[PDB]
Amino acid sequence: HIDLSALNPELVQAVQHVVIGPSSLIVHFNEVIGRGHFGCVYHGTLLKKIHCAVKSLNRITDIGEVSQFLTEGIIMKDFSHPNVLSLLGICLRSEGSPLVVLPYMKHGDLRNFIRNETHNPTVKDLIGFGLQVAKGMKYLASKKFVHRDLAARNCMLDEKFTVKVADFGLARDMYDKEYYSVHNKTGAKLPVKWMALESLQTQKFTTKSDVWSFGVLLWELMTRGAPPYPDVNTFDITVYLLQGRRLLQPEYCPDPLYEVMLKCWHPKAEMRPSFSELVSRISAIFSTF
Ligand SMILES: OCCn1cc(-c2cnc3nnn(Cc4ccc5ncccc5c4)c3n2)cn1
């Protein structure tokens, strides 16, 4: 049972902006639509019935950990952009950690979508998805928000095939454990094959390290969801990058788009493009299609 009286009053006020009453939420706990380390995602209906995704945090039992997670993620309620996942609300109830209510994404995560052989997205399709992500990140960067886990698995596609940058704020979790490793300086599970060289070395994350991750995501898109560096052990990713080595150009990646990827992975963080620059560059590349 989570008591609001025990929680920081400032956090309580913030949360009370987006609270959903239990009687307004129906959750189908027999319908798992995603699985994270903090809890699963379930089909829900919000009430005018709205189809939604309900993210559990029930694996987080410590009040202090729940408090910290809410504190770090609540700013999500302040964001509004077509390429950024929105928050529908938070359901506080009698027993269990708060439920995070999110818009339902009919087409799931971007990586699974492009790996699906029946979909067979074209080069144009894939660059288009990449442009959408760049716009969402441009928005978050303008808000000084550092994502820290950008990757194709962490972007969702809605019913209109609009890409939402996701897995941040209250929606943050590890949804595919295979791509997080403890082989790094922090000893915690991190997406090391998406991380900028300086993040692996200094444990610090910035918008410019998000740009590095975006470069990897672009590579994911153009390979239709191939795993990066399949032949590089998690023990070796830092030295691999230190040696100046990088992901190779995908077969169906246009030369100018691979140039963009390489700029995203410049060893000097300040030498890498802003997301505003990336939107401009990728928009031009897309338009030639
Ligand atoms: O291999 C991992 C596949 N996978 C990625 C996710 C994922 C990646 N980033 C996310 N950001 N928020 N949410 C929760 C969420 C939000 C909306 C959903 N709509 C339909 C189906 C599942 C949904 C899951 C996210 N889920 C779920 N499964």
Swiss-Prot record:
Location relative to the cell? Membrane
**UniProt effect for mutating residue 43 to Y:** In RCCP; constitutive autophosphorylation; causes malignant transformation in cell lines
Free-text description of this protein's post-translational modifications in UniProt: Dephosphorylated by PTPN1 and PTPN2.
Span list, region Interaction with MUC20: 265-289
Q: What is the effect of changing residue 165 to I?
A: In RCCP; germline mutation
What happens when you mutate residue 175 to H?
In RCCP; somatic mutation
Domain of life according to the entry = Eukaryota
Q: What is the effect of changing residue 179 to C?
A: In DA11; not phosphorylated in response to HGF; severely decreased tyrosin kinase activity
Effect ascribed to mutating residue 195 to T:
In RCCP; somatic mutation
Region Interaction with RANBP9: list its residue ranges.
157-289
Q: Cytoplasmic side of the membrane: what ranges?
A: 1-289
**Residues binding ATP, per UniProt:** 33-41, 55
Where in the body, by tissue, does this protein show up?
Answer: Expressed in normal hepatocytes as well as in epithelial cells lining the stomach, the small and the large intestine. Found also in basal keratinocytes of esophagus and skin. High levels are found in liver, gastrointestinal tract, thyroid and kidney. Also present in the brain. Expressed in metaphyseal bone (at protein level).
User: Where Phosphothreonine occurs along the chain?
Assistant: 234
Q: What is the effect of changing residue 43 to L?
A: In RCCP; constitutive autophosphorylation; causes malignant transformation in cell lines
Described by its record, this protein's role is as follows: Receptor tyrosine kinase that transduces signals from the extracellular matrix into the cytoplasm by binding to hepatocyte growth factor/HGF ligand. Regulates many physiological processes including proliferation, scattering, morphogenesis and survival. Ligand binding at the cell surface induces autophosphorylation of MET on its intracellular domain that provides docking sites for downstream signaling molecules. Following activation by ligand, interacts with the PI3-kinase subunit PIK3R1, PLCG1, SRC, GRB2, STAT3 or the adapter GAB1. (Microbial infection) Acts as a receptor for Listeria monocytogenes internalin InlB, mediating entry of the pathogen into cells.
Which proteins does it associate with, and in what oligomeric form?
A: Heterodimer made of an alpha chain (50 kDa) and a beta chain (145 kDa) which are disulfide linked. Binds PLXNB1. Interacts when phosphorylated with downstream effectors including STAT3, PIK3R1, SRC, PCLG1, GRB2 and GAB1. Interacts with SPSB1, SPSB2 and SPSB4. Interacts with INPP5D/SHIP1. Interacts with RANBP9 and RANBP10, as well as SPSB1, SPSB2, SPSB3 and SPSB4. SPSB1 binding occurs in the presence and in the absence of HGF, however HGF treatment has a positive effect on this interaction. (Microbial infection) Interacts via extracytoplasmic residues 25-656 with L.monocytogenes InlB; MET can bind HGF, its endogenous ligand, and InlB simultaneously. InlB probably dimerizes upon binding to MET, which encourages subsequent dimerization of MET.
Q: Protein name, please?
A: Hepatocyte growth factor receptor
Gene name tied to this protein = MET
Which part of the full protein is shown?
A: 1052 to 1344 of 1390
